[PDB]
Design a binder for these strands. Structure first.
Ligand SMILES: [Mg+2]
Length: 1356
RNA sequence: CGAUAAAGAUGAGACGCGUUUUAGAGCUAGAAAUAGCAAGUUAAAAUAAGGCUAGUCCGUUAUCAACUUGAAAAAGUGGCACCGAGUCGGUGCUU
DNA sequence: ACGTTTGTACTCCAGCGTCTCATCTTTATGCG
DNA sequence: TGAGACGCTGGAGTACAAACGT
């Protein structure tokens, strides 16, 4: 049989609702066979439900942890390189030194050598630690002591700098220098060179004006303000070049010959400074050197707080100053505390639990916490003025290793390491040869375009090797093919050609592509002759002629008439008849002109044999941005020219990639005539054929393109096609589950395709922005709006008084004040009525002290109220209070009333969705369903895929009182899918000619301007498609209210205009929808998933005696070293075995549920029996092991259901089917103050909800019965009942708003805490999965219709 | 209509902390329990256990009923109408 | 008739900041 | 430029009464 049905879907990020409806909007019921060893053999289920799953995670955290792993590996390798340099000479000094350093973590018992790592004896270690309290004392000593040192100490200093080498954000050289002296020298050079209008901001110390903690822009403003005459571009050119790595252009700020932006801290700075010095003429030379010296001084000013005149290690000397001043402040604070407050001494200096000094040093308190703790003590104390001054400066009792050390670059550490190497090079000859080698160890850094240095066993690697040997920092440039790796870095990410998915895409500035754009805009154009109106075709002679004369002489082409006139200087004139070509051609040769200008010879650019040289040049310029790669690549082309053109074109840069390959432009020869797409675009042969036209058939190019498209595509896979879509991974998971649900539903209904599939995807500072807009409008209008009332952000949510403020305290349609004392005076009126479109947003809403401005169904009346309000709306639109579209709608009556084009726009706004992801999933479903072809090879639409927006179904909820409360249960997903199906199939049945507007596929347009052409005297049963009013859903309502105070009735049974088929019966279909929404059984299924991710919590706990700790390495006992804790269970396994119980060695047979940690998953799957015997179970039944992932469903007595959260915790698995009357009452009561409707409807709802005050007790009884049946939380239920009895004498609105909160006790899933009325009910957790082991295990399919029930009591 | 900008996704290269164990001899009185006092800023190693494919790779993303074939990819497995509805039940035909 | 493991009830806790570079879609916005 | 910080839900420890073996 045909078995007509439809499928509705509600795709979400956490759920997928589905429903099957018949032609009468009924959900069919079916009985399904259940497998397993249970007695149950058939169960009846409705064909409606939802699938719940955890949200998909993006691959960001995994990428960050992978990068961290690579960084740790490379840091360890750096330390290993330094060790293997030092090893040979270290064996002659202390042979066990590196072994003692490696084993320093483990305890004294496990050490193979002495406990003291550095010297190996107690006396020398104590003497060393007394002489150098920190590593920075040793670093400064080794820089400045000019005496032979112990090689251990030299290694310790170099290893400290190599391990923590600082950042690489500043390129080029940097050295220690004051900032004020540098500014004085900059001003000196400025005055010396200019000798006219000298900027002399004397008395204004630039020190700490530029060095202020404010941003570079604010420091620049502070410096420029103190400058007497000089302001902005000019002096701030040099100032901003000092302050930042980017600076304004030297063409205006320094009179340079070209628009070259200045730079700093980059390799491009040297080349651009050379170019700017050449352009200016060396007049600005050394005036930029003074600025660069000031830049270095300003950059180092806040990291090296010590004078450089006494040492070459300012960093270490600054750290020693910090240590010394920490010691002085600590002893002063100790003396002051004991003398003033001896009772607080123990709390401050001994208690690690608080945020005192003991908690700051030995405890977990940070610097900010310590400052916050000790600040009120220092205020309450006297004689601590310098301590407070240091505290507000954040310079009190600081540590050397702090969070703020990230500003130290690598050049400072490199300078200290170089100083030490140069100081200790005489005594150790090996250090002299390895000096450059150790320096290269510190400064080496893998380029971002090279990536991981893999041999081939890596997903993420693209590096190519010039030689097959190990990569070290010293042979990196000799082994790694940097140019090929940099090319592959970009070419692995650029998208392939859509027509042929095998080869790459051509750069967007390529010559062969720009010529394609110009000639594809050429061949379609054909000037109209004067003799005959025939446009003919712009022939190839004029193809070359136009491009050579105009495009090849101007960047942007001339005007339409100007380009003609230019050609008419060589052709017939006074005949300007363009081929409807645009005013100015969109195409532009911009890269050929750049190449001709750089090469300084047009012959090179004109040369067609030299087109490949140009192509490779543009590809090199687009690919690389490091300029060393460009230099290396273009070095091969130096012969074709000279050095000047080489360095002029090396600085050129292009961005962007096209969408065609070279094959699709000049590769495919198009069979007959042997000419490529470009050649057809040159000479169409009096046919004037565009790219789109030519890429079709009749030239055999379409056959080869289709062959490549199908061959390379290979059908891919559904998972693959979903993978390379846009959007979040969570919505990709939702789409995949949706497709699998559709396949299962098709299988369920006798392998019969549905007639229709309805698609809907959930798309779920503006208050502060609205408050700012109200303030700006009040300031612009000069009105005392705040005097009436301030813009309260508490009231910024509510839309009632929005009009009392935005409309200038004046009625919108009436020329008087709005009377803000009475908000009930105003009545919200939609500008374009709801019979036209549901524009409930405030863009259309307006209020006029309830004045009947219009007696017409038009938006406003012609002139009249519109005219009077239009002037004030001109004022409000000037203030932007009235929106542009708002004013357009308000003026539309004086603009001719409501037009047919306007109504067409309203219904296309109500119907069409603009999201591309919805189009993608609709295309996927249509491709999967419609798979048959006709005899002429034409697709036949067995099913239709309808896409709907949320506004339609939401309005269907609000108008017809099918109210949704999310907190009650998960049935609302399935109900949304059912109403999705009902609305979609009613719309396609009642309006068939609008199927091009919301159904996927190539459909006849059926222009709505002819449909919406009905007048006030409605045609009815005609081609007008009942589209005068133009609300697409208005046909659902029995009586359509109008803004003119009239009610237009609509017949009880709706039918199609052309076909005589009943599409909506208002007397039976609403009852059917109500019955379906009141059905107690819908298939809610939680997707069982094996947990993946981290092994455990990342916190490394201190050592305990517990066995819950996890060893951090193989031979690190957690009892001695601490370790990780609280692992994550991948899945639980039900084992049946005999265990060693009792001191009498008894094999007590036991059935247990053991969880498999993610760490142990591979070991368990390699050999489950060996793993279980290792765990402690003897004689395991191998075939009785049941893998139970998370959310595994178990059924118990009285229908109680539990989901497996873990091996030792359960979740609630039941669903509360609250009756429709109670959820409707709860929605109406909770939304008392936010009814958002007509005043009569609001009064009726208030009367209905006041008449059913007893419904609260019934809802409480329902919750109590459901909790006593399946929840089994006695104490929480008693607290809930006591709280409800306590707050009985409360208004209905808050009572129902908190009864809504009460539903989380009975909600499906993990238990959660909730608050009813100032009382918090903590969650009751089922932390014992012992009753599960004798329950019924339910294996569910994706829809849950197919089941397999296993009685676990019978296993064992 | 170009064009910019934001958001999101993906990949690479790097810093600074944080945590853990050890090293930085605690002194005095008391037999000890305990007290009074002195100190404290730093370093080494690890930073998912680990894997082989031994790279200066890889290891937290995606995929996720049960059962029957297949190494895997994957394929295959479950009757329909009507009356009703507290998580689905009952009746009739054929299997 | 105690010890001994198990079942409620409650509390606490969970690695985090920054920078450079590149490639895509998809929306939007001011621009024409 | 502008901070807004938070939940979530499973593990672990602690205290104490009760089902439970000898
Ligand atoms: Mg939903």
């Amino acid at each position: 049989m045909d078995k007509k049905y439809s499928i509705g879907l509600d795709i979400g990020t956490n759920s997928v609702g589905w429903a099957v409806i018949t032609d009468e909007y009924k959900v069919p019921s079916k009985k399904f066979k259940v497998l397993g060893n249970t007695d149950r053999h058939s169960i009846k289920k409705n064909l409606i439900g939802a699938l719940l799953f955890d949200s998909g995670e993006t691959a960001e955290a995994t990428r960050l942890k992978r990068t961290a792993r690579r960084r740790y590996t490379r840091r360890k390798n750096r330390i290993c390189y330094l060790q293997e340099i030092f090893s040979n000479e270290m064996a002659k000094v202390d042979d066990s030194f590196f072994h003692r350093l490696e084993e320093s973590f483990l305890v004294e018992e496990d050490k193979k050598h002495e406990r003291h790592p550095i010297f190996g004896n107690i006396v020398d270690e104590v003497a060393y630690h007394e002489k150098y309290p920190t590593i920075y004392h040793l670093r400064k000593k080794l820089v400045d002591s000019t005496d032979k040192a112990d090689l251990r100490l030299i290694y310790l200093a170099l290893a400290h700098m190599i391990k923590f080498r600082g950042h690489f954000l500043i390129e080029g050289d940097l050295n220690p220098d004051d900032v004020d002296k540098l500014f004085i020298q900059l001003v000196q050079t400025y005055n010396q060179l200019f000798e006219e209008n000298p900027i002399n901001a004397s008395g204004v110390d630039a020190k700490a004006i530029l060095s202020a903690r404010l941003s570079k822009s604010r420091r620049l403003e502070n410096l420029i303000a103190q400058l007497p005459g000089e302001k902005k571009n000019g002096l701030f050119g040099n100032l901003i070049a000092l302050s930042l790595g980017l600076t304004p252009n030297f063409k205006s700020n320094f009179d340079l010959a070209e628009d070259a932006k200045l730079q700093l801290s980059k390799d491009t700075y040297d080349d651009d400074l050379d170019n700017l010095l050449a352009q200016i003429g060396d007049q600005y030379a050394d005036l930029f050197l003074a600025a660069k010296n000031l830049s270095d001084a300003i950059l180092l000013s806040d990291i090296l707080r010590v004078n450089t005149e006494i040492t070459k290690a300012p960093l270490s000397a600054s750290m020693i100053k910090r240590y010394d001043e920490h010691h002085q402040d600590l002893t002063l604070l100790k003396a002051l505390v004991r003398q003033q407050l001896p009772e607080k001494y123990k709390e401050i200096f001994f208690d690690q639990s608080k945020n005192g000094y003991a908690g700051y040093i030995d405890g977990g308190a940070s610097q900010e916490e310590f400052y916050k703790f000790i600040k009120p003590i220092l205020e309450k104390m006297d004689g601590t003025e310098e301590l407070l001054v240091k505290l507000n400066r954040e310079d009190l009792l600081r540590k050397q290793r702090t969070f703020d050390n990230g500003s130290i670059p690598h050049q400072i550490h490199l300078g200290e390491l170089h100083a030490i190497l140069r100081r200790q090079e005489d005594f150790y000859p090996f250090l002299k040869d390895n000096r450059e080698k150790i320096e290269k160890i510190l400064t080496f850094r893998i380029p971002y375009y090279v990536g991981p240095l893999a041999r081939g066993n890596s997903r993420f690697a693209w590096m190519t090797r010039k030689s097959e040997e190990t990569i070290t920092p010293w042979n990196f440039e000799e082994v790694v093919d940097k140019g090929a790796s940099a090319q592959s870095f970009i070419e692995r990410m650029t998208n392939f050609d859509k027509n042929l998915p095998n080869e790459k895409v051509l750069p967007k500035h390529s010559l062969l592509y720009e010529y394609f754009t110009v000639y594809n805009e050429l061949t379609k154009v054909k000037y109209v002759t004067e003799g005959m109106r025939k446009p003919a075709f712009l022939s190839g002679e004029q193809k070359k002629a136009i491009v050579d004369l105009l495009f090849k002489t101007n960047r942007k082409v001339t005007v339409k008439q100007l380009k003609e006139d230019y050609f008419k200087k060589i052709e017939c004139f006074d005949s300007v008849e363009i081929s409807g070509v645009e005013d100015r051609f969109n195409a532009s040769l911009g890269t050929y002109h750049d190449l001709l200008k750089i090469i300084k010879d047009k012959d090179f650019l004109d040369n067609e044999e030299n087109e490949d040289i140009l192509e490779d040049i543009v590809l090199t310029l687009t690919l690389f941005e490091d300029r060393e790669m460009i230099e290396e690549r273009l070095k091969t082309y130096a012969h074709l020219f000279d050095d000047k053109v080489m360095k002029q074109l090396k600085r050129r840069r292009y961005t962007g990639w096209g969408r065609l390959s070279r094959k699709l432009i000049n590769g495919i020869r198009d069979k007959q005539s042997g000419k490529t797409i470009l050649d057809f675009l040159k000479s169409d042969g009096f046919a004037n054929r565009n790219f789109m036209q030519l890429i079709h058939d009749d030239s055999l190019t379409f056959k080869e393109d289709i062959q490549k498209a199908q061959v390379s595509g290979q059908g891919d896979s559904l998972h693959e096609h979903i993978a390379n879509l846009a959007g979040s991974p969570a919505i990709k998971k939702g789409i995949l589950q949706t497709v699998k649900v559709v396949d299962e539903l098709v299988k369920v209904m006798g392998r019969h395709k549905p007639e229709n599939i309805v698609i809907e995807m959930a798309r779920e500072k503006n208050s502060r922005e609205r408050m700012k807009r109200i303030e700006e409008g009040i300031k612009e209008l000069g009105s005392q709006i705040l005097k009436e009332h301030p813009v309260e952000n508490t009231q910024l949510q509510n839309e009632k008084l929005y009009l009392y403020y935005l409309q200038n305290g004046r009625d919108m349609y009436v020329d008087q004040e709005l009377d803000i004392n009475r908000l009930s005076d105003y009545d919200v009126d939609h500008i374009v009525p709801q019979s036209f479109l549901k524009d409930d947003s405030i863009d259309n809403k307006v209020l006029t002290r309830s004045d009947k401005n219009r007696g017409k169904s038009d938006n406003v009346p012609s002139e009249e109220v519109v005219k009077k309000m239009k002037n004030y709306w001109r004022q409000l639109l000037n203030a932007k209070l009235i929106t542009q579209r708002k004013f357009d709608n308000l003026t539309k009556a004086e603009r001719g009333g409501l037009s047919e084009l306007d109504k067409a726009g309203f219904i296309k706004r109500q119907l069409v969705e603009t999201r591309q992801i919805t189009k993608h999933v609709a295309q996927i479903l249509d491709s999967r369903m419609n798979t048959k072809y006709d005899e002429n090879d034409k697709l036949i639409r067995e099913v239709k895929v309808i896409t709907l927006k949320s506004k339609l179904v939401s309005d269907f909820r609000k108008d017809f009182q099918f109210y949704k409360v999310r907190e009650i249960n998960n049935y609302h997903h399935a109900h949304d899918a059912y109403l999705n199906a009902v609305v979609g199939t009613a719309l396609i049945k009642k309006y068939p000619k609008l199927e091009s507007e919301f159904v996927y596929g190539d459909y006849k347009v059926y222009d709505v301007r002819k449909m919406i052409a009905k007048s006030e005297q409605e045609i009815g049963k005609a081609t007008a498609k009942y589209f005068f009013y133009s609300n697409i859903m208005n046909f659902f309502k029995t009586e359509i209210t109008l803004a003119n105070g009239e009610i237009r009735k609509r017949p009880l049974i709706e039918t199609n205009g052309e076909t005589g088929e009943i599409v909506w019966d208002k007397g039976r279909d609403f009852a059917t929808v109500r019955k379906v929404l009141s059905m107690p059984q819908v298939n809610i299924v939680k997707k069982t998933e094996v947990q993946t991710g981290g092994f455990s919590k990342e916190s490394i706990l201190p050592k305990r005696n517990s066995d819950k700790l996890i060893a951090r390495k193989k031979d690190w006992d957690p009892k001695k070293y601490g370790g990780f804790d609280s692992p994550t269970v991948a899945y639980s396994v039900l084992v049946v075995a005999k265990v060693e119980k009792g001191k009498s060695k008894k094999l007590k047979s036991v059935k247990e549920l053991l969880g498999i940690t993610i760490m142990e998953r591979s070991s368990f799957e390699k050999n489950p029996i060996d793993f279980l015997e290792a765990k402690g179970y003897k004689e395991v039944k191998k075939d009785l092991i049941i893998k139970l992932p998370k959310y595994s469903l178990f059924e118990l007595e009285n229908g109680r259901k539990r989901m497996l959260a873990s091996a030792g915790e359960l979740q609630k698995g039941n669903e509360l089917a609250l009756p429709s009357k109670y959820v409707n009452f709860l929605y109406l009561a909770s939304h008392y103050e936010k009814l958002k409707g007509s005043p009569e409807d609001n009064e009726q709802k208030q009367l209905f909800v006041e008449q059913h005050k007893h419904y609260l007790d019934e809802i409480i009884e329902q919750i109590s019965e459901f909790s006593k049946r399946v929840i089994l939380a006695d104490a929480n239920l008693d607290k809930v009942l006591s709280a409800y009895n306590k707050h009985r004498d409360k208004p209905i609105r808050e009572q129902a708003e908190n009864i809504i909160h009460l539903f989380t006790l009975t909600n499906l899933g993990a238990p959660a805490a909730f608050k009813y009325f100032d009382t918090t009910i903590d969650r009751k957790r089922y932390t014992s999965t012992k009753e599960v082991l004798d329950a019924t295990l339910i294996h569910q399919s994706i829809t849950g219709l197919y089941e397999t029930r296993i009685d676990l009591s019978q296993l064992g």
